[PDB]
């Protein structure tokens, strides 16, 4: 009963932390109703607020303990750290606020909560830190108490209670006020009394050149200092800062202010000191996606009311081009590393035109470019546009490779969407021609590729880098002479190492090289070679990269006698898929091993084996273990109630992998009782169970299946519904 409660609560917290639902004001209500939902019988106990906060404290600490103490059994390079940073952010940011506006400011309850923990967590944390590395080794408990001090929750005499008996902390040194302090140009810590005004004032005077070249922290801009010093922000103030961006960003879309839109996207993309992760950890990524995709979709109507007959048009067109081009880079970074799908948001919001959405089909075909150039895709049945489609290709090739200048007429007559596909087409044709031997002059091309770096033509580089590895992978296996190979690097180095960069293109060029750097580095090392890796490692070191082996980035001289793994999930012959899933069967059945409570290592494992084979190889294999060994935890093989709770562990886990939000549960109950519902959950178990339920019922009318077999299958189905309806999601 207690074990059931703790398992259910740990999996519930893990799922809710993954699902970005911390910002939901229903967190405490669901956490309180967990106890009543788990026990079918009525449990009418008045749980006081201190009890709720204490339960949250030990639940979070034990969950983090298991999360960090299950990592040694993983592969040493099966690196997934998004959830680790997510735990850190939650425990250091939200729980202090949860106490702040949920607690009664009782110092005793905090002492009881942090004194009731086992020493196993402390021993494991210290052992792991020592193995990774006396040097200052602070734990997550110190950061928890420090945040409470800034909120006036506890006096400065409380931190000394939990400190080691030999080392104290000076009370005066610890910050005690929640006011923003920034180092000015003269070194005085200035008080930022107003947050929104500070952002807009700095944003207006912000320079796009100061993004990556300003390695030093002594920058005159206060806002840029905050990004590199993001780890020390006050607990309550960062919520205001995150909310400040949202209100400012939504207003910029309404007013069509192109200057501030492009600058904002540059800060968020690079993710200095884990800046972007905290943003999703406060606003829901769905709402952020909706406004962001509205701009990229509704921008079509904005080009029919502007006439290029003013000297500010070239300023505006560059401002328009960069505002649109940067907004694309924000989506790709979110989709690739942060695990968000563009298709899902269109289904949830009916106001988005799926069939007429250019963004949706662009991302899914990002690494692949069409061999033919089409001005419009929905009207391929017409030939009038195809006549001038070839005209555009020859017009741009002659002007950029022979004339050496870009006429203003070409830019005005073409849209950004055609440019996003025109640039990959031309570079592919030129690069392919060079490789075969059609093009033999390099020097004219080196200057030619310089024109792709202008602010007007910046959006054309997004698809250029993705195609490179597919181009390079064939090159790696194919036999290419060094004379051609050194030429390929010469043409490539022009895009990689420009001689000069404009004040609006230097940060953009680094940003695009950061999206698809990792697979490029692996292919390049398989072979003027060093500068490309030197440039690639330089742009990889500007900010941390998630789920990457740090040995790969700095493998210049380190030789640890262990082969590097470039992927999130890695498998060897010594530890094949059999051993891990046999250890999963030992955990799916007897809850052995230590790979559980790790949805990083399990969700990817499910996909690698597919939900069908994952469920098929465990459901029917359970009987063999059950028929011989028996139900663990009971010394008597009497009754099926003991085995009933064991089945609840397996079915409750599958529910969370299917249901992700609150209102979604109320609609899946109607799916079972019988269009838009199953669209979002193509790979869910619920679809697989329901599609077989209706199909075998059809055979029941025709009588090709025994009645006993049909009764067995529905037993699994009704159990899934029964827990779905009795538990609130």
């Amino acid at each position: 009963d207690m074990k059931l409660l703790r398992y259910y609560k740990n999996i519930w917290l893990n799922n809710k932390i993954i699902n970005w639902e911390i910002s939901n004001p229903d967190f405490l209500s669901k956490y309180s109703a967990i106890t009543s939902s788990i026990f079918q019988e009525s449990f009418n106990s008045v749980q006081n607020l201190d009890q709720l906060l204490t339960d949250l404290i030990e639940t979070s600490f034990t969950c983090f303990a298991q999360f960090v103490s299950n990592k040694q059994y993983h592969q040493a390079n099966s690196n997934l750290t998004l959830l680790e940073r997510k735990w850190v952010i939650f425990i250091t940011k939200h729980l202090p606020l949860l106490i702040l506006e949920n607690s009664s400011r009782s110092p005793r309850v905090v002492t009881n909560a942090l004194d009731n923990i086992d020493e196993k967590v402390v021993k494991a944390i210290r052992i792991y830190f020592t193995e990774k590395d006396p040097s200052t080794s602070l734990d997550i408990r110190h950061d928890f108490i420090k945040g409470l001090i800034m909120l006036n929750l506890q006096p400065a005499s409380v931190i000394n209670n939990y400190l080691r008996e030999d080392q104290m902390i000076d009370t005066s040194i610890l910050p005690t006020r929640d006011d923003l302090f920034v180092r000015n140009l003269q070194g005085i810590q200035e008080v930022v009394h107003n947050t929104n005004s500070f952002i807009i004032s700095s944003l207006d005077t912000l320079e796009l050149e100061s993004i990556t070249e300003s390695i030093t922290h002594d920058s005159s801009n206060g806002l840029f200092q905050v990004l590199h010093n993001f780890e020390s922000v006050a607990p309550t103030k960062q919520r205001e800062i995150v909310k400040a961006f949202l209100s400012i960003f939504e207003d910029a879309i309404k007013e069509l202010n192109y200057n501030r839109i492009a600058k904002i996207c540059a800060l968020l993309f690079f993710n200095f000191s884990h800046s972007l992760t905290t943003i999703l950890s406060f606003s829901s990524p769905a709402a952020l996606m909706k406004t962001l995709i509205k701009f990229v979709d509704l921008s079509r109507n904005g080009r029919n009311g502007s006439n290029g007959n003013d000297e500010s048009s070239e300023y505006e067109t560059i401002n328009i081009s960069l505002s649109f081009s940067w907004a694309i880079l924000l989506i790709i970074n979110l989709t690739q590393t942060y695990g968000i799908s563009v298709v899902d948001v269109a289904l949830k919001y009916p106001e988005l035109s799926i069939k007429n959405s250019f963004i949706i089909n662009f991302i899914s075909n990002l690494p692949n470019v069409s061999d033919k150039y089409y001005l419009e895709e929905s009207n391929v049945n017409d030939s009038d546009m195809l006549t001038k489609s070839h005209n555009t290709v020859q017009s741009w090739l002659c002007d950029l490779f022979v004339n050496g200048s870009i006429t203003d007429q070409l830019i005005q007559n073409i849209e950004t969407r055609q440019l996003a596909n025109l640039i990959p087409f031309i570079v592919k044709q030129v690069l392919l021609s060079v490789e075969i031997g059609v093009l033999t002059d390099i020097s004219s091309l080196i200057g030619g590729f310089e024109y792709f770096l202008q602010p007007l033509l910046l959006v054309g580089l997004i698809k250029t880098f993705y195609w490179l590895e597919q181009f390079l992978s064939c090159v790696k296996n194919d036999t290419i002479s060094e004379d051609i190979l050194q030429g390929i690097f010469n043409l490539l180095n022009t895009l990689f190492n420009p001689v000069t960069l404009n004040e609006d293109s230097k940060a953009f060029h680094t940003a695009v090289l950061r999206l698809n750097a990792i697979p490029l580095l692996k292919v390049l090392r398989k072979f003027n070679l060093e500068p490309l890796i030197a440039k690639l490692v330089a742009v990889l070191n500007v900010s941390p990269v998630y789920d990457v082996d740090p040995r790969i980035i700095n493998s210049e001289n380190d030789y640890s006698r262990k082969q590097l793994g470039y992927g999130k999930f890695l498998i060897l012959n010594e530890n094949p898929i059999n051993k891990i899933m046999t250890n999963q069967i030992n955990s799916f059945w007897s809850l052995h091993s230590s790979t559980y409570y790790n949805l990083d290592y399990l969700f990817e494992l499910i996909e690698l084996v597919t939900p069908k084979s994952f469920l098929f190889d465990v459901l029917k294999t359970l009987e063999y273990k059950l028929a011989t060994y028996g139900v663990p935890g009971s010394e008597n093989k009497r009754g099926s109630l003991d085995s009933e709770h064991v089945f609840d562990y397996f079915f409750y886990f599958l529910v969370l992998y299917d249901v992700k939000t609150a209102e979604e549960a109320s609609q899946l109950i109607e799916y079972m009782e019988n269009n838009k519902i199953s669209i979002l959950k193509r790979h869910s178990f619920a679809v697989l169970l329901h599609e077989r339920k209706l199909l075998n019922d059809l055979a029941l009318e025709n009588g090709e299946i025994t009645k006993t077999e049909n009764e067995k299958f529905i037993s699994y189905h009704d159990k899934y519904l029964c827990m779905l309806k009795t538990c609130v999601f």
Binding site: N361, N365, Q470, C474, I577, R682, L695, E704
Partner: protein, 764 residues
Amino acid sequence: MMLGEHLMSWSKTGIIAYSDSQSSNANICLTFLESINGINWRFHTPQKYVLHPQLHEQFFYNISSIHWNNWFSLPGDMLAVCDELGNMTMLITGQRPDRATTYEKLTMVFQDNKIYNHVMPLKPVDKLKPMNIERKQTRKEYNTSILEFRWLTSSKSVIVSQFCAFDSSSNTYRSRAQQVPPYGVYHPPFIKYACLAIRKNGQIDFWYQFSNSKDHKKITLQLLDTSNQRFKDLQWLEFARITPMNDDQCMLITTYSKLSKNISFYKLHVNWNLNATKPNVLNDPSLKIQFILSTTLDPTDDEGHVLKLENLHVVSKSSIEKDPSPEILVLYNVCDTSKSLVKRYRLAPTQLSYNLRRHSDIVLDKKVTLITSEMFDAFVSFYFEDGTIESYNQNDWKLETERLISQSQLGKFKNIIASPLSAGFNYGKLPLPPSVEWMKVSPSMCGVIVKQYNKKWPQFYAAVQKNYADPEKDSINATALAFGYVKSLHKQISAEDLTIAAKTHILRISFLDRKRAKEFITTLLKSLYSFFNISPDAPKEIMDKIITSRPLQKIMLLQLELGSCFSQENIEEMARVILYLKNVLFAFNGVARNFHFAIEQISNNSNQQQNPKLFQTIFSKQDLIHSLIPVAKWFVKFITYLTQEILILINDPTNKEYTLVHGIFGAKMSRTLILSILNEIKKVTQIVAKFPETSYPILNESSTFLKLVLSESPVDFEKFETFLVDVNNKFIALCEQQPSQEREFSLLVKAEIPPEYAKVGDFL
């Protein structure tokens, strides 16, 4: 869940080897079709066997896939089965270490775990003693789990037919056969055989055996030839379909790795002879691999409905078709909608002034649960949920069962028919896939095999036609079934499935009008001769070629089964006597050639009489002639039956039940065939008289008895010899009197004389 696409395999010789998952003592089963009482059919008794990795000297594992070597022009007897653990067990049938055996007895070649040679003849489980073997379930998908198995053909060429058209000028159907040169990868003659298997981890295997040795060799590689073993053991391929391409020694390993969520393409190259300058030094083939292309799948349709990849089946396309690029049929299902979309892609090189070009999209109204590609037929089968099957042709993706309705009749070639399915013979209400363990359309598409959970025996469903009351469609149907066998013989298929389907339609015809059904047989078998460019109205030179032809062993067998229900009818009797005369032909002339060579061996081997080899040679000379005596008794007993009917028919010429006597004499080659038998009989007796046995008088009994049985026959052979000779001359002058080609068919098959030639019947 996906069905068992490779759980069962119909061997080209009729053996149905399928996986067994219910018996606790066996994992494989063998059976075949047999006739109950000449009319009905039943499957043979299941011959259960047990396969475990430790047959070389104990728990056995489940069977993953069964692949008969029926690909291309291979003999189709060497069965190699791969278990769930990844061990490839090769079983040879029809051969024993010491002698030759029938097709229902198995034998091992080698076992893989390292590979070693161990020849051992397997025995059935039921006959074997109770052994200590339990069904251990390998519920783990190992690195060595073979995804797709493919066989390698030899350098032999295969000749098949593509289609037939109705020649309205002659009001007859015409077919053209085109030779198919080998395409893809083929193993040289000096290698006994070769095979390829792709494992789920990406590791590849290449088993081969040298024709001059018994030891087996294995060469293994991995697809992802990276410098790190971290990614070597990561390629968990969901689908790995190997389609040979027209490129020399190349196989397109179309794989879909969910790790990178892209349909990656590969190319595999093999050099059979590394050192062509040293033919004597047989070097191991070298294996090479080269990455080519990778693409991402489309998320949505045109109208805004998302898609999920259900299956990735690429068709094995030869160079015959207009665009030889293989069709990558990525199936998608629109969720909560009965529609199912099948997007088609083709791989083509990138041209200057590779890539995947999208041709079109095809929408199907029902969800698909299984896809099986037909062999040597170019037919993709869509096993929908409701049991209906819609086979789309590879050429145009036009439905075969509805092609006639939508065919543009006007043109030079009309009524293009490729299979009996084009006529309209649609399968009935098949059992629902949830209850079905596995399905497989029969090779001729005439019926479907269904294995049921509660049925201990395989079922069978045939094709039915709703408009059986319309008499005008008999002309098309007979021609459609005529071409069904034409493809089967060229592919050396038994085509027992097609025989059952033809009889059921004939039976329904005979229930209403018995007269109509008889004409259906005559028209049906006539089209076979036209399709194969063999003419029973040709001059006598071609007639000798007909007797030695294999098809008469099968085309005559057709009426042996299609005419069984007709009691007291001579349609089957006429075919059997000619067929048995062929067996009678193999008796005398089969040994007349053998006996002739024994004459020369006597003279040249007369210089060593005391050697221990001549004594056995001498004994065998006079023993062989003894075994012919029982055959000669039936030979005399046969000619008396026809002579007896002569006396009976004279008194009552109006008896229709004794019309078989007319056809026997009417057959043109039979009169010559018996004359040839009488000729060699005279030659044998003359040779025996010229060269009698003198060393041992006791051995002369067999030679003397041969003379006695001929002289003591109740009817003199010389008088009977002139009987058939005179019939031939009279039946030739009648052809010049009036030209007719149906009389040749009538005297050979119908065993009757047309009413327009009633005067000819009185002469006999």
